[PDB]
Design a protein around this ligand. Structure first.
Ligand SMILES: *C(=O)[C@@H](NC(=O)/C(=N\OC(C)(C)C(=O)O)c1csc(N)n1)[C@@H]1N=C(C(=O)O)C(=C)CS1
Length: 473
């Protein structure tokens, strides 16, 4: 006797996964064998072919139990029952219905033929949701996801993917104060109510299971290590001329090569690999690795989603010069979009990392101070200048608010366009990561492709959360 599976809701109680009654029909072939004249009407009502159905019953004539069909609607099930065929019996089972469909398909996940979790929350909280067959019903679960922010993020990421002719994308929104995942969307997506088709690529929760090189989006962590060392201040200068730096057989290169002296904010604005590498040589890679490890890059999230990827943060006992530079500019590191969002949330939350949660958090757990508050506050200010200053990532500006962030562009020529940031700068509330895989139009830089999505989504999410606009006199 299958048990009723627990309702999944969003954080405000909107239904996301609902157990729906279905009819399963079984037969005692010993009794069905006494009513062969009824078989063709029964075959037609079950959908099945006349002769194939007849062959099936004859083959199981000595059995006392066989399944005829599973998961009919309790309309077609009543239609088979109205035939009054001897030996035909019914069992009430459950099939999930997902009211928001493709919009939250990767996060909510789905169930297999036996109504057991196969992907996402359905799989991760299967014990909680499943209950026990007879029969004790499963328990309700409220997610951290806010369906209003989810609809917005879904729409904007889909629109950006079409405008850039991209292969795939992910967008995660986090509450920096509580560790809650407020939205998590990917493209391509699928309709979890359509149990035919089922494209494995479209079902991938990319924000959690796909690893990527974060590139320039890790530079704020390298800078946090520089400021915490006691050796660097934002007004310090680094000479990046002539825009390249030879380290043995390896050549570090900047995209814009018309700089000489840059201050630390300028290094982030211009996204100078040479500048961040020179700072890394001075402070040592051990300090940078420790910040990136502590914010969770390439570390287990603790979420318990089977198949979730940990990625990799390279480590050494003695760091060679090339690896010191590449670590500092995010080359050769492998992270997930959830990890990158969580790292930006700790930075935004004055350096305190609050544990990640996919469920609504009522009592917030204690956070861990990973970056000193003063250092996190200084880096936040630099990231606000990255968005607001002359020559900055102007497309990440959020009209009405002070926003902060960092763009990234990774050469996989195929590219991945990134933007990670938070808002409002006066008292950060939300961190967001936008990852667009293989944009195919003229623009591929993170500040061109991903920054406008951050702006559109952040503009709506702050307003949906009634956050007061902070760009005031
Ligand atoms: C940060 O992401 C920087 N990106 C890189 O240096 C990488 N590649 O640079 C390009 C120009 C795309 C290349 O083809 O080599 C890179 C880092 S990890 C990886 N696999 N590739 C800088 N980021 C930006 C930005 O803000 O988006 C720039 C405009 C200058 S390069």
């Amino acid at each position: 006797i299958p048990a009723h599976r627990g309702l999944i809701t969003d954080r405000n109680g909107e239904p996301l996964a609902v157990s729906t009654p279905v009819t399963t029909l079984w037969a005692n072939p010993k009794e069905l064998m006494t009513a062969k004249e009824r078989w063709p009407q029964l075959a037609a009502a079950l959908g099945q072919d006349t002769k194939l159905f007849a062959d099936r019953i004859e083959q199981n004539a000595e059995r006392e139990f066989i399944y005829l069909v599973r998961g009919l609607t309790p309309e077609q099930g009543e239609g088979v029952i109205a035939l009054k065929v001897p030996g035909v019996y019914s069992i009430e089972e459950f099939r999930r219905f997902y009211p928001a469909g493709e919009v939250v398909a990767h996060a909510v996940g789905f169930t297999d033929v036996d109504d057991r979790g196969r992907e996402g929350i359905e799989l991760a909280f299967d014990e909680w949701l499943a209950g026990v067959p007879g029969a004790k019903p499963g328990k309700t679960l409220a997610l951290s996801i806010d369906l209003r922010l989810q609809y917005l993020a879904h729409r904007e990421l889909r629109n950006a993917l079409l405008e850039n002719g991209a292969k795939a994308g992910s967008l995660v929104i986090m509450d920096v104060k509580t560790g809650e995942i407020l939205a998590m969307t990917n493209q391509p997506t699928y309709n979890p109510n359509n149990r035919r088709n089922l494209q494995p690529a479209a079902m991938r929760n990319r924000a959690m299971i796909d690893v990527f090189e974060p590139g320039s989006t890790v530079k704020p962590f390298s800078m946090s290590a520089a400021l915490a060392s006691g050796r660097w201040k934002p007004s310090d200068i680094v000479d990046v001329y002539p825009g390249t730096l030879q380290i043995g057989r390896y050549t570090i290169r900047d995209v814009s090569r018309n700089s000489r002296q840059l201050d630390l904010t300028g290094i982030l604005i211009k996204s100078s690999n040479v500048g961040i590498s020179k700072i890394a040589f001075d402070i040592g890679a051990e300090s940078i690795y420790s910040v990136m490890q502590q914010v969770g890059l390439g570390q287990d999230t603790g979420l318990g989603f089977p198949g979730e990827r940990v990625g990799n943060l390279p480590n050494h006992r003695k760091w060679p010069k090339a690896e010191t530079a590449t670590l500092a500019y995010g080359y050769g590191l492998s992270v997930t979009a959830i990890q990158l969002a969580h790292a930006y949330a700790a930075l935004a939350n004055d350096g305190k990392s609050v544990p990640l949660s996919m469920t609504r958090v009522d009592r917030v757990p204690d956070g861990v101070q990973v970056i000193s508050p003063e250092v996190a506050s200084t880096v936040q200010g630099m990231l606000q200048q990255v968005v607001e200053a002359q020559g900055g990532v102007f497309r990440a500006q959020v009209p009405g608010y002070h926003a902060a962030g960092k763009s990234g562009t990774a050469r996989k020529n195929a590219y991945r366009s990134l933007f990670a940031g938070f808002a409002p700068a006066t008292d950060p509330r939300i961190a967001m990561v936008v990852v667009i895989d293989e944009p195919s139009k003229a623009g591929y830089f993170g500040g061109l492709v991903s920054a406008p999505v951050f702006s559109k989504v952040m503009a709506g999410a702050l307003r949906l959360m009634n956050v007061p606009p902070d760009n005031l006199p």
